[PDB]
Symmetry: none
Subunit: 322 residues, 2 copies
Amino acid sequence: SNAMIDLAPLVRRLAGTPLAEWANGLQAQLDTKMSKGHGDLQRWQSALDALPALQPEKVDLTDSFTLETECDGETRTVLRKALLGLSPWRKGPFNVFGVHIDTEWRSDWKWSRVSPHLDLKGKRVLDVGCGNGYYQWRMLGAGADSVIGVDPNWLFFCQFQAMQRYLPDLPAWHLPFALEDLPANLEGFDTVFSMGVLYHRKSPIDHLLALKDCLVKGGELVMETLVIPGDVHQVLVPEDRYAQMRNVWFLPSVPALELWMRRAGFTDVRCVDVSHTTVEEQRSTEWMRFQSLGDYLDPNDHSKTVEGLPAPMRAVIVGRKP
Amino acid sequence: MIDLAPLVRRLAGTPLAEWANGLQAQLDTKMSKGHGDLQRWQSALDALPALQPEKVDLTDSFTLETECDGETRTVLRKALLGLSPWRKGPFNVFGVHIDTEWRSDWKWSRVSPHLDLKGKRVLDVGCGNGYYQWRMLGAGADSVIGVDPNWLFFCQFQAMQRYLPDLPAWHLPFALEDLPANLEGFDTVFSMGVLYHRKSPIDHLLALKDCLVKGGELVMETLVIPGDVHQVLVPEDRYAQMRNVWFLPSVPALELWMRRAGFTDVRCVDVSHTTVEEQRSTEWMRFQSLGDYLDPNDHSKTVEGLPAPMRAVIVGRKP
């Protein structure tokens, strides 16, 4: 009972690009996936159905995600309650007609540091593991021609739908697919982002190659992942959990990761941003009640996780497809 | 002591009347036996603030609302945490979100549209903390009795009943075998998450059938495997780290067993493969959960190499 999405505008937008053939089959693939996901989608429909009919008088996506319109107290209460029905909210924050979706992450802080290193104007962008799509909006704010996000999580998809309701003309799409669901050798995006995915992949090199295969020649990869201090030979694989997370594989040093990207065939490879993640930028909130960074750090030594491993440190590395 | 007089009144004139007239004495004795167990949770129950809801929703969720300041909410939260671990739920209790291990709300949404509970006398076998009992009233049930021989589950029900004291739901800390034979007094009986723990799945089905009036309905949920009518898994040792797991039939095998037990109009209404979004450790349930029980390299298997948890809901009628 979630409406089907009309992809005809996406098909129109991708005509005359290497993405055209793929776009021509997306409507069928999306329709099938949403049929199969009907049960899961029902979990969030009452929340989506309760979102009030409002249109922004003002939109900013360049310095934040902020939507403004004339909205009374009663309407704001309805909106706030509907949005809370889509919790937990991880990437953000979103300012939605005076409702502050105070998400787990200050994704805006990180974006602010990365964006000045990139020229997105006129580019077709893919965001891999996009979560709720927060960054897709910001990539439009930085001038992207179009942004497609992929993440096979229905709640993330519904959080994107909530925002797209109020931004229905903008060229951003969220596809509830895994990266492996894209065809081989798509080679159609100008820029690809993979933020927070590499450390969950058994095969980091295959991940890098899959991202390269998404890019046009001359395209750009922006890779963010968990790293450790040290030289080119230092690579951590946890015995069990890392910051209480399962399925954590390789945590290379920055020089190790740069070398792997060169072996995967990227050029102009360099780190643009490194930092230890702070409890100020990642924490539980009213909108994301579950445990968060502070809970996963050694309570006596914030430089270590509860397992005694080096605490979360993220690097952003940029490279080009030669 | 818990006063069962309103239950006795509610059941007068039904086939459950005679049994109800013996319940208070049985409960009192069971609670004597369980005194030592019950003491563990008394201070937490005693710490629950005196509050009464201004708004109650049991139909679309479990949500209770009232005027409550931060200091009372702090006391409420601490008391409720004293009853950890919380498995079935979630409960929204005056702004305190009991984020339980299970999204039992999701499962309820998959099951309830297939059932008509309006005006029915319902028994919930293996009710855990009684979450679904509240939802069954939300769905129009005249009354719900839950049975589960676990003292913590009993105390978790008491915690919610404190705030919903006039609703016709009761939790009995009994095993199904503690009910007399041939009660034949319920319109609908639920057995959710029990069959796989029974050495005798057929005796379980017959015991459930014996609780029902003629024309009554059994809602059966349990762990299953893929395959045809001949596929039946019994683990060599553990299944998803659990001891005492016996039969995991295929859906067609389970339907056949239900027909052999004498049910008619037997049909599977839901099949789902349990995900870590539906079952997980939380601040309210800190012990291990589903993600720890799956093969970390192949989530289609348990850590033992067996097919990963798959649940089926099957409905049948007593002829």
